[model samples]
Structure formats: C-alpha cells, structure tokens
Target: WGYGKHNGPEHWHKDFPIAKGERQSPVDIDTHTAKYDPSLKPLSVSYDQATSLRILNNGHAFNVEFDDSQDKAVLKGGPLDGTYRLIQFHFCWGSLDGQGSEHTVDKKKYAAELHLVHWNTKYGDFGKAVQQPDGLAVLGIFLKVGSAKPGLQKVVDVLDSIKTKGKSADFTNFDPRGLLPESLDYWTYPGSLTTPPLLECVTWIVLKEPISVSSEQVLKFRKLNFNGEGEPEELMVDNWRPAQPLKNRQIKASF
Candidate 1:
C-alpha cells in the first residue's frame, strides 16, 4: 500500500501482518527515559571517499547507492556484535517543513529523516541476511530545516535531475562520509525496516544529534514524484511511516 490515506501506515498490517509485530520500527524516543548504558562501546564508522555509485528515485524515495561489493565502508561497535557494511542511504520527508522524520525524540518531529542502510558481513549476502534477525543495521538521523549548511545541501543540489520514479544519475562526486553529526552518541534497539517488506532485521542506531538544512534545500525534495516519467504526477512527500508501538523492547544508549 502507498502513503495515501486509504493505503498508508494503518493499512499496512492488512497485507503485512508483521506491521504490528514486536520488532517493528520508527518508534518515538523519550530521550529522558532512555537508559544510559556505559557498557556499550563507542560506534565506529569508516567510509571510503569513492564508494558512491549512483543516485536514483525508486518510486519510494531518492537513494544514493554505494558499491558494497566489499566492506570499504563499515559501521560497527556500539550495540552491534560485528561489522555491517554500508549499502545505500535514502530519505523520507513531509510536504511541509515541520513534520517528516520517521523516528522522533520526546514526541518532537523533524523536517526530514536520513536512513543509512547497512548489512551484516557475518551473513552470506544482503538478500540472505535480511531474513536473519541480526542482519541489518540502519542509522537514523533527524533533519531540521534551519539556516544551517549541512551535507544534505549536496544531495539537494542533485535532486532536480532525478525528480521522477525510476530516474537515476551517476553521482560520482559525492562522499557519504561527510554526512554525519558532531557526535556518534546514539540510542539503539532492535527494529525492522520502516518501509514495506518490514523485515525485523534491523538494529537501529538513532543519533542524538541533528543535521540542519536550509528550507529551500529540504523542501526541494517535495518536487520529487512517486510516479515514473510519463505517469500522472504524485508528489512523494510525507513518505515517512508513523511511529510504531514500542513493545517490550529496550532502548540501549551508548553515551
């Protein structure tokens, strides 16, 4: 189901029963309630300057893919047991600047959200790993629309060309590593993919810091269409799924 009123988040469980499952994603974090665990190690992220392959709009969201044929870019430590290779990164947003981020803090929403998807190397491949419980790890970063110059500006500058579904361009000049907050401190927990497939294989690492972007920059994404080149225009804004219930899961913090 799409993000329309009739087929959005509420209707997802009808098709995918796991939508209401225990490990579902995009839960609101009451930062004050998060338990700070000192046992958790600091997160380690290593990215290669040349890993970016192409940028594309897959009818869902615009994504900048990486050449994950190896572990050139990796996210490890923190609450993870082993290394996870960087695969691709995408975004979710709202029609307006006030609300879009998938994961919230203290019931507060951001203008947009950034998801850096990764897969465990312990498993054979991404497809195979996805079916495993401890398979994927996604870094969730909130995006605020302010008078700040952040890495999202670069991604925005290239959004004009890939404005329709199935559209893509060789985005060779960008480096995904430059897109990070000042701190690696995060709140992590077991969760699933926020999108369809909704597989319960992600260990979510939601950063405590936010990356600010200019209104003109983040709003530029609202121009993207969910339909293909010739299809009737359906703007791809508010693509973020509403927060799911946080069952018996615990939010482990690495401060």
Candidate 2:
C-alpha cells in the first residue's frame, strides 16, 4: 500500500488500527507552537564508515543497510536514554519537485526526507524494540532543492543498480553524517512509523536544517521500479505517508 487511492494513508486504519492511534508520526511541526527545551542534549552519532553493507530496493524505497552486529555504528544523547544501533537509512519523496517529505514545518513541504533508523541496545533487537515505548529512534532529515549534495551523490549513484524491487548491491564505507546539515537543533516527539505495521514506538528527532539536493537528483529517485522483474512496472514515486494527527502529542525543540 502506497500513497494511492486504494491503499493510502486514509485507508491504512482499515488494516492497521494503530494508524489512528494517538502517537502517530509525520505531524506538521508548528515552530511557533513548539516548546524549546534547554535540557535536551545534542545528538551523539558514531558511525564506522566501513559498517555500511549494501543498498536494497524493498519496493517502497531504497535502503542503505549497515552492519549492526556490534556497536560500531550507534546513536546516543539527544532525547534518548540509552544507545541505539544504526540499522538502515532510506528516503521518501513525491512524484514532483518540492513535495515529498513526510513531516512539514509550518505547513511547508520539502522535496524529500531522509530517515536514519536505529534500535535501542537495551531491547536486544528491533523486533523487541518495536513493542516498547522507547524502542526506536529515527533521525529525520528534510531534503530541499538547491545546490547538489555531494554526500547524497554516493547513494544516488547506485540507484540504477537497484532500480527494480528486491535488487541489492554492495554499498560500503559511506558516512551518513556527511548528509546532515550544519545545525544539530531539532524538534523531538513521540510518534509511530510512517509505513504499515505502523508501530507507535518511535522517538522522532526532526532536524531544524535541511540538506540540499539538485532537481535532477530528485528526478533520478523516481526512476526506481516498485515491482520486481516480470511484474507490471510502477514508478516508485510518492512513497511518503501523509502527515498524521498530532493528537495530544507535544513537539519539543532542542536549541
């Protein structure tokens, strides 16, 4: 189910009741309404460039996976209480330019959004983490249209190799930190996964600054196929889930 009429965000509640749950994700962040908390610590990221394993197209989006067998790549500090191991990073975008990111700022949509997913070390695995309130932590990076992003090029360059669903290629030694903007300031909140299964166990950390990408790069992402070989091909565009209701959630800012 994608952002289509048959199986879009509006219809997600039919299959996953949690879709309408209180702590849903991709909420529009009203900066003026967000409370600035001076207590939130700066995020601590430690990624071993060599821990990157491969990139795979799981039909929805392309994910750059990492070797999380050890603590080589982990995230700490911020609003988290313990270390979270890096698992994979993926992106979501729209069919056209300037509208793809899941979360919006003051109702402003960006071209795309990058998600770096991690699981709490205390939980043993991502599976178990998904069941707890403080199980997962995702770093949300908004992608804007502007100058070319050199760091992003390393991942975009391999899109052709994994254009079809289920295709994967070796993608190692990449530093995800390079894709981040200068500012570490962010808005933190409790939310669920934007996709199906829609587990409400994520601690969302949305960066205040957005990284730049060229228009051509945004077009290249649409070239990916949502179906596998021999199956009817569908352009993998607009894979983003619409922003959900904030409900009683509070958006905390770290400045």
Candidate 3:
C-alpha cells in the first residue's frame, strides 16, 4: 500500500508492529521545555567528497548513497559515543510548503526534512547495526521556504535523471556537509526509523537551524514518481510520517 489514506502512518502499525514501539521518531520538539546538556559536545562531521556514490529513486524518496567501506565519511562527538559512518541520505516532505518536515518545533512543521543516515562502526555493517539501540545515528536538517539553497542545487539538479523508482545514476565527489547550517546546535534523543521495518535503533540528532530553499525548489520533489516505467504512475508527495508518542524519553539539547 502507498503512503496514501489507505496505508499511511496510521496503518503502518498493522504490518510493522514496532511502529507502536516506545521510542518512535519524528517527535515534536518544544525548545523552551527541552533541557540543555552541557556534556554534549559539538557534532564532528568529516565527510570526504570521494565517498559519494550514486543517487537513486526507491519509490519513496531520492537517496544519495555513499561508500562507507572506510571512515572517510563519519560523524562523531556530539551525542554519539563513537564514530558513525555515513550510509545514505534521504528526505521527507508534504504536498504543501508549510507542512512537509517529519519533525516539528513546538508543533510547527517546516517545508521539508533531510535525513543523513549513519551506522555505528562497532556493528561492522549497516545490516547488523539496525538491530541494536546504539547502532544507527540519523542527523536531521529542516528545510524552510525562502531563497534557494545553492548547496542543495547539486542534488536538485540530478532529480530529473532519477524521476522514477528503481532509477539510479552515478554521483560522486560531493560533500554533504555543505548542505548543513552554520550552527551545529541540536536536540537529540533515542528514536526509531520513521519508515517501515520501523526499527527502534536510532539516535536522532535534529539540528535547530533550518536551511533555506525556494518554493520552486521544494515543489520539484513532488514531481518524482513513486512508480517505475510501465507501472501505474503515482506522484511522490507527502512522504513524511507523522510525529509519534515520546513515551519515557528525554530530549537533550546541545546549545
């Protein structure tokens, strides 16, 4: 089923039982009520441009996969206990500019959200890491509507090549760090993947500062097709999972 009315977040729990788990993701963050933790260090992101691999359309969102055989593209410090290698990155959005991001600030949604997925080095492989609580570390960046982000143009330019599902193209020598905001301030907590399988093994580090993108740039994402060639066409829009219950988790801020 598609992420439509018949099989959206509300219906995910039926197939993926973990969707009802305690530490689910895309939680609404109340900055004023969050506790600031001095122990949290500034996030250390070292991404080698050579590690860039390809971009693909998985009938979900566009993902930029990277070569993580080594520690060339790794994220350390901050809320992490060790190094986490970059695997791939994807995004979530809504039909409208005002309601796309998966996570919210004081219940306010942004235009979109970028998720840089990583797996801890301790697990050796991303497959093994998905089962442990400390296995995955996702860095979330919110995208707001404003002037177009030049740094994101490189990614947006390749969207036309991978408009349909199962399509992929060679993409290399690109640094994802340029897409991040200048400030590294963030809110962190233990959570799960916002998609199916809904694995509860992620440590989410959501940035406070949002990057700017033009309305036209944001609308291009909706042009992507969830179905491949020869299949029934389905436009990719509103791919964001709604905010889930926080349960017994505490959100720590590094400000």
Candidate 4:
C-alpha cells in the first residue's frame, strides 16, 4: 500500500531535511495548455480570515499547521495581492500503480497528494520567501481512490492523532477552512519543490477536482510513523515523489 524499500517516495528525504530542500513541492505537471479561463477566477479565500492552527512535530513531517493570524487569507486582486503568507500545509502519497503522485493529470495516476504551502508575507516567512522568484504558492490536491470522498474526512480524522513518533495534537476549535475542495478548478504553472531545495518560486495550483479517500482511508495512510525509535522506523511508505519534468512549464487549466 505505501511504496517499497523502507517505505518509498524517496524515503522522504531520510527524515524531512526539508525533504532535502531545493524547493520541495508537488511536481510532475507535463505539457498542458489553457483550459479554465472564465475570466480567470478561483481565488477567494476567507475562512473568516484563518488564524493560527499549527500542528507540527517535524520528527518526519506530520504537518497540519496554518497561520495568517487574522488576515483572512488575503489576496483581494490576484497577481498575488500584497504578496502571500499562508505558510503551512503538506502531503504527498502513493500506493503502487506506477506510484502515487507529484502531479500528472492527462497522464493520469493518483492516490494521494496535497499541499497548500504558501509564502510571501511580503517576503518575510517561509524561510525568506522560499528563496524568492515570486516566492512560493503551492495548492495541489489529488487523492482519488473512489466512493465519494467528502474532502478527505477532515484530515483523515487526524490520523489517529499523528499516529506516533514525537507526536503532537492540537485541534483548537478546528476549521482548516473545511478542507477546501468545492472545485476551485485549478491548474496553474511555474514549478519547483518536488523535493530537494528545488525552489523555483512555485506558483503551481494543480487541482482539476480529484478528492476521494476511501480504501480504509487509504489504509490510514499506511499507518504513518517514519523514523522514530532508536532512529529507524520510517513507515509512511510511498511518501510520493516521482513526477517531475515540465521544464518548459505551461499548465493553466481552471475549469
């Protein structure tokens, strides 16, 4: 279910060395020209203005963090309004069949993958705007297994409270913007961050509606728990990362 060899997906950078920096994000978005241009809309964040709701343990990246502490996901007029700053949110998955995901639609193939790592805060956070270019802005989602998945059951019901290893558990009031996916119909461009300090100033969106997670909730994501005891457990298998090569970039869907 997860992947192979000590749980694949490049073994998640041996233990989240920022996933071996280089702008690690969700890649694999091959040639795809325009698609959704109904006046180009789908950027209306306002979860009553998302405040802080962090839930990280970094023992191997079990993130569920969020912070904008009262700015309300601001981006009033595009081109990235006043720059960005939605800091954390992460995911990447796999379970066989040519391996999970990093990005690939027309080429099909998905099981799990989600990222919402934003940064810009006018260039302050996300480790100095992820090394700038335009500064990060990832928002990919893809978790198809089937049977009507209601937006990933609130982060898979908190995966049994981070399922071990240096654990963490914060669920204040909780909202996570209701785990968005009302079909923001996306597919923007500009890559980087598929792992390893690949920072190319991400601005990818990749989300043409693909939300489902049932197969025992993908086996509770392979009962996550990588590298813990005595420094060698690693079990979040197939952490995903095998779709990169759009060097020319140009995927602008949104319909």
Each model's TM-score?
0.96, 0.97, 0.97, 0.33
Q: Which stretches of candidate 2 lie over 4 Å from their true place?
A: none
Model 1 lDDT-worst window of ten: 145-154
Clashes of 3: 0
lDDT per residue for candidate 1 within 43-151, as digits (tens), equals 9898864478889999889889888888788999988899898889998999988899999999999999999998999996899889989999999988887776665
Off by over 4 Å in 1: none
Give lDDT tens digits, candidate 4, residues 116-206. 7777677766777778777777777777776645645666678777665677677444455666667776767766676545567777776
Report the number of clashing residue pairs per model: 0, 0, 0, 20
Relative to the true structure, how large is the alpha-carbon lDDT of every model? Answer: 0.88, 0.90, 0.91, 0.63
Q: lDDT of candidate 1?
A: 0.88
TM-score of structure candidate 3: 0.97
Clashes of 1: 0
Error of 4 at 99 (Å): 14
Clashing residue pairs in candidate 3, if any? Answer: none
Report lDDT (Cα) of residue 214, candidate 1.
82
Q: lDDT of model 1 at residue 97? A: 81
What number of backbone clashes does candidate 2 have, counting pairs of residues 3 or more apart or in separate chains? Answer: 0
